[PDB]
Amino acid sequence: QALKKYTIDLTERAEQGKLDPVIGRDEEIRRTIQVLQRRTKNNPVLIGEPGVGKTAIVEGLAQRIINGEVPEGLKGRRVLALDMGALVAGAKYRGEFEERLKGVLNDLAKQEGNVILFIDALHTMVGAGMDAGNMLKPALARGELHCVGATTLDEYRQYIEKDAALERRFQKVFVAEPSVEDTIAILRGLKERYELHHHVQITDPAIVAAATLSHRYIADRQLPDKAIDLIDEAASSIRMQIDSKPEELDRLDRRIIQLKLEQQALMLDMLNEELSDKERQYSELEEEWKAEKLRNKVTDAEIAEVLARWTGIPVSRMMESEREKLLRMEQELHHRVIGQNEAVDAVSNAIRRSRAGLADPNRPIGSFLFLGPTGVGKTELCKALANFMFDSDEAMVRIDMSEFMEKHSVSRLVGAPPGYVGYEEGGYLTEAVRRRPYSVILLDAVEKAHPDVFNILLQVLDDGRLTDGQGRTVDFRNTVVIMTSNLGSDLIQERFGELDYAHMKELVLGVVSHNFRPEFINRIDEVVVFHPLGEQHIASIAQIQLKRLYKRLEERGYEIHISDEALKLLSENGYDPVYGARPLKRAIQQQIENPLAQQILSGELVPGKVIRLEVNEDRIVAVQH
Amino acid sequence: QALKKYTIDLTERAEQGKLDPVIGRDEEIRRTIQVLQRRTKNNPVLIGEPGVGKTAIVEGLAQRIINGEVPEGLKGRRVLALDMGALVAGAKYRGEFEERLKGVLNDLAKQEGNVILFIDALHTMVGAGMDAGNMLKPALARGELHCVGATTLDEYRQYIEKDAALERRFQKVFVAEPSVEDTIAILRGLKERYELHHHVQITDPAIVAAATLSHRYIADRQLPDKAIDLIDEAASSIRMQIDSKLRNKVTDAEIAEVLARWESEREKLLRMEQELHHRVIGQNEAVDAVSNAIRRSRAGLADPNRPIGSFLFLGPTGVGKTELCKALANFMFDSDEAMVRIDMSEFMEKHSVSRLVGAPPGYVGYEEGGYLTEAVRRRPYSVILLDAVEKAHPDVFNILLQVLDDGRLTDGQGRTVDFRNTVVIMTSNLGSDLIQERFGELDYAHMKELVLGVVSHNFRPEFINRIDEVVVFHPLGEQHIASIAQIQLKRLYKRLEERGYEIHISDEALKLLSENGYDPVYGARPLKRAIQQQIENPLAQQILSGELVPGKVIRLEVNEDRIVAVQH
């Protein structure tokens, strides 16, 4: 016939048991039935935001038809999913699509109200290519159709609710986003199905952890789809681990084939100890793989591993390298930002609270306001944080808050409202965080901004969400919102002597209370207060800058030894307590980098030998021996 | 034909005589003949508000063509009219506006220039997505186009005076709204057609009554459109009254019925003392003074460049001063919503004036606008309320002198804000204890003269020169304010009867309610909030517990120091 060709039954496959279990939805299937046998405005249409199981509700409907839990007026019914494109794919001539549609209508009338029609994505069949919708509309306006639709509320509004001639033939069967416990039950039935697929084992605490983690972190997709995708990708992971070997041996396998290819490319090293140690570690872990002869269940830790490698938040197991790297994170922040104990204390404790799970899941991680005069390393600390956490200085959301000195460059940092010029390019902040929900946001020098940008930062540091101009919402609640300032510079440089840290913090906090919004300062996590550097701190910073100068000329083909008196010349010529550690850098730049490059471009200095930077009387001299 | 797709022949029906016998607007037809008989730039445009009979102007020109009442260059023409609302609404994609447009142009080139076209809404021609200025502007300069434009001056200068090349061809013809008597002349020219349609007669006193009342009460649609609408619908109503199951002449009574639904003016002005005592007890002399001032403003003897009435108010505040302004706005123009409460307590600087009148351009409150003049511009028939005028900066009184002299005020944005349709109420309390402590047995007039001398020593004499009359606002006694409390109890019982409860009261409870918040120093609103907070809050506490039933008699019986509600 025609229904045997251009429609696809669902009740046969539910009768053949090919369709998935559908759990819950009792109120929704009941109101589906209620609208389904309503005399006027007969045809229901499901409204569900994408994923909440509209197609699952119609599959469960056909499964209850086979189960006979429908009323007696609905037994013997058939559900024929009308395939929109399968009508189209042969209609090369004129009106042959319309002939197919009219013939489907004639055979559906011939079935005489014993067949329910299922049209998924009804907004596609608003106009499906006069063409389709106005052709069905008389068969709508005769009561002689059992059409069932399912579309997301955006499309039912903007394609169907516009046409008031159609609203008198449909009915808002509004599916809701399911609760987490309904998601637990759905995942238990689908756990049975997926363990029958993969031949694996899934634990019920892993179910409830997948539900809670999926609800908490991935703010984009909607339930219960994201929990199913967690479970299914984790099952693929466990079956692959059973298949070849565990992933630590695969880490070492790809590492030694990497060093194999790069060793063959070398036919200076930094290479021998790595390759030897990892061949030894591969032998040891291959021996342990033989000794345990592994992972063959699904714990919640596997769910955390899938979720971490999907979003980017480190939700996974805190291995020993993380604990060592974290106490070394205190140590390494003092390896790159020497001095300024309070800031390293605050940020270290913040990230340690975040990895320990004690962070409040309704705010961002730790939102710091930095104070203190210029070049005690405010931006250097923020670069140290990003270059710890992501191992790059520019791997961070740098927002230079001195470009926003108009009221209306909030359009830059958030987005264009709709219809305007650059609308479909978002903001800088909002886009770059919705790409990467775990990253460090440096609002650089916040006190230069126009004061109604602090509204946006109030919403951020209030709840870690933000409404950009494209309507959506951002999940800031895995970010570190660090701001810098120097608003007590005269005061901090005045009274860092003879005042303890509490009185200093309270006094400059009062000055900041004069500057900022008093709404805003209380919403901050923690205001750490800095101090100008002493000469030994500046000597340490000089040693660090001289390390990177040695690295710059080690690239070129030169080596440097420095004397011991000349570092005192740097520490005294490049010193005042008023402008931070930058007169050190200017003094280094002049008193070393000008005569050195002057003599190198002369051709005077020679590669291969040692540039012994010794002293003049009141200058610095280079030699070559 | 494509002429049988988007054009309308009016020489067709005018040769048949089957259009309006258009009477009036001869000079606009004459200037249309002036533009159309030029060699070049032969596309006149009509300018006016929509509904001034521009289609009738074109049809009357067509009737003068059929009658031969035109000079010998306008003859043999065909009156056409092109749609500007289907060439775009049918236009799906690139070139469906332009396709139809060039098809119209070539099919009129077949017509060889013996065709006059009409186009309304010339602003629509500019913006449709380019579209038609670049394709009619050659025909605008070729002279082969014989268009008749029709739009309004504001859209004309918003869209069309942007491009001066489009501006230089069309010739502006102002078609204003006709008068009431011109409407009478047109309807007398058209009473014959109505009476030949419905086979009835028409009362011409009802015609002039309909014209006058349509001019006064309704400003949605305008002349002559609203008169045609009211006459035709009233004739329909009379026709249904005849053919229901008896007069053929439509009366002005049906005009007033369709007017108010779909006269109490003059004697309501005459009975204005009773009107002020419809809701306000006490202040009898102030009522008489306000009513006499209203009637003298309606007497039509004063300056036509000066407002309704200049006033300064004194005495104890909150006793019904604002309530007088509310009832005055009610029985003056509409209701209790055409008024602007303004505190002069704030304004004490130069940027105070920049706030209240309007900022200069480039500054802080510019399109936020003046605090007074914008609210006047929104509500042109209101009553202006001022509070504590002694707390004003002295240069604000220069603005007040401009109000009371010219009746108009240029705001910061630079336009005219007319004041000859409002009431300037300025309230103060400088002679408070002069009236309060000497309320006993001292007259209205000499107390007025005494506090007039006091405020004369306070304010500027030239300022109070412009003031017509300063009423006293003597402090009302306990009986008047008790009666006001009774009226508040009445409207409270009205709202609770909307909720549906039979509620009574004890008279001792009424005395305690009258003695809750009585105070001669503050006003009546302390008594209002006192009675309000005493009664309302335990009431709903008793209600939503599940105690009170709609229909039970609720006597407000007294406690020893409180009032208890009973359910009987």
Partner: peptide, 24 residues
């Protein structure tokens, strides 16, 4: 035997305009 013609599909955009303010 009809062939579905590819369309022209004219589009649209807009543009705001700020306004600074002196602050006397």
């Amino acid at each position: 035997a009809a062939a579905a013609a590819a369309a022209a599909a004219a589009a649209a955009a807009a543009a705001a305009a700020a306004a600074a303010a002196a602050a006397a």
